[PDB]
């Protein structure tokens, strides 16, 4: 009877690691940040300089 | 659970060269030297020749 005791543990095997996969690929996603685009360059009111 | 093994390496190796496509196309941009624009011409201040 070795053969139907064997199929079962391999079944429940690859079920519960299919599972995991998917949580982290799942997690993996939507785990990046990213950047900010600067604004237009900020007009010039003035420039000067005194001692 | 030949297929659960074999999903994770491929997900690894596709994130990996994204990452480096990144770098090389970033690193290809600013990488550009151009041209300075020679001012107006200079004004003839004077011609003349002698032996």
């Given at each position: 009877?070795?053969?139907?005791i064997?199929?079962?543990?391999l079944?429940?095997?690859?079920?519960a690691a299919?599972?995991?996969?998917?949580?982290?690929?799942?997690g993996?996603s939507?785990?990046?940040a990213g950047?900010?685009v600067?604004?237009?360059s900020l007009?010039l009111?003035?420039?000067?300089?005194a001692r």
């Amino acid at each position: 009877v070795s053969p139907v005791i064997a199929t079962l543990l391999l079944i429940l095997i690859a079920v519960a690691a299919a599972v995991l996969l998917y949580t982290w690929v799942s997690g993996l996603s939507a785990n990046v940040a990213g950047t900010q685009v600067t604004g237009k360059s900020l007009t010039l009111i003035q420039a000067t300089w005194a001692r």
